[PDB]
Amino acid sequence: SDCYFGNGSAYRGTHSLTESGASCLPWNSMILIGKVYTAQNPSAQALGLGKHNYCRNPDGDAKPWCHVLKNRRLTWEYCDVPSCST
Ligand SMILES: [Cl-]
C-alpha cells in the first residue's frame, strides 16, 4: 500500500528505496548467497521475497527493510516507507 501498518510484516508494496536513499538489492541477487532473507528462502512465497527488489519485513524487524550495497559493501537497511500511523 502507500504505508505499512504495525511493523509492516504484512507489507507488500513496491517501495524499493532505503532511508539513506539507496535502492534495494533484489531478493534473488547472486550477491545475497549465504543470507537467510533471500528469494531462495524456503518461505520466500509466504514472505513476499521473490524476483523483485521491494521492501519487506520477513523477519519481525522494526519496519520493512532490504539488503543494499553501501559503497560496494553488502549490508541491509530500513526503507523509506511511511508508517500508516505517521
Ligand atoms: Cl538475511
Cα–Cα–Cα angle for 22, 8, 66, nearest 5°?
30
Domains of the chain with bracketed CATH? 1-86 (2.40.20.10)
DSSP letters, 12-39, are -----BBTTSPBPPPTT-GGGBTBSSST
Please tell me the distance between residue 23's alpha carbon and the centre of ligand 1 in angstroms.
17
Please tell me the distance between residue 86's alpha carbon and the centre of ligand 1 in angstroms.
27
Please tell me the distance between residue 38's alpha carbon and the centre of ligand 1 in angstroms.
7
Enumerate residues with CB within 5 Å of ligand 1 (an ion). 35-37
Quote the DSSP letter at residue 63.
Answer: S
d(CA 15, CA 23): 9
Find cell 509466504 and name the residue.
46
Candidates 86, 72, 63; CA nearest to 15 is 63
Identify the helix (H) or strand (E) that includes residue 59: none
Measured in whole angstroms, the distance separating CA 49 from the mean position of its chain's CA atoms is 8
Please tell me the distance between residue 37's alpha carbon and the centre of ligand 1 in angstroms.
4
- Expressed in Å, this structure's resolution amounts to 2.4
d(CA 69, CA 12): 22
Please tell me the distance between residue 81's alpha carbon and the centre of ligand 1 in angstroms.
20
Cβ partners under 8 Å of residue 86, min gap 6: 3
